[PDB]
Amino acid sequence: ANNCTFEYVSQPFLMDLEGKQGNFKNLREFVFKNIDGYFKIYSKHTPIN
Amino acid sequence: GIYQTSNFRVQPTESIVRFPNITNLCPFGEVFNATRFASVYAWNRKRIS
Numbered sequence: 001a002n003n004c005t006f007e008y009v010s011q012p013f014l015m016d017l018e019g020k021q022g023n024f025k026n027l028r029e030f031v032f033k034n035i036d037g038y039f040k041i042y043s044k045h046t047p048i049n
Numbered sequence: 050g051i052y053q054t055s056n057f058r059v060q061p062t063e064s065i066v067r068f069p070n071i072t073n074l075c076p077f078g079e080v081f082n083a084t085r086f087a088s089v090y091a092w093n094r095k096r097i098s
């Protein structure tokens with residue numbers, strides 16, 4: 001990984017420690033985007049099975 | 050009779066100023082106060098965003 005430009009660091013997001021056995025399926029959705037030089041992102045966490 | 054002459058509106062008492070913080074915590078500090086500064090021939094950079 002050579003020619004660098006930017007490097008941002010953050011803690012993990014959208015992850016927990018839950019223990020269950022059954023029907024608990026979840027859906028994760030994001031919005032990747034690139035507008036005005038900013039790779040925008042919109043999200044909506046919707047736990048649903 | 051009655052004649053609508055003028056209006057007497059209540060003016061704002063003051064103006065409250067403050068910032069909502071938002072994208073914050075700049076590491077910009079660790080630029081001037083550091084150790085092992087490079088030489089003149091050597092080139093260095095530190096992108097901050």
Ligand SMILES: *[C@@H]1O[C@H](CO)[C@@H](O)[C@H](O)[C@H]1NC(C)=O
Binds near residue numbers: 077081082
């Ligand atoms: C380097 O020293 C200065 C002098 O007081 C002080 O601001 C701090 O300890 C260091 N600089 C930064 C930006 O943290």
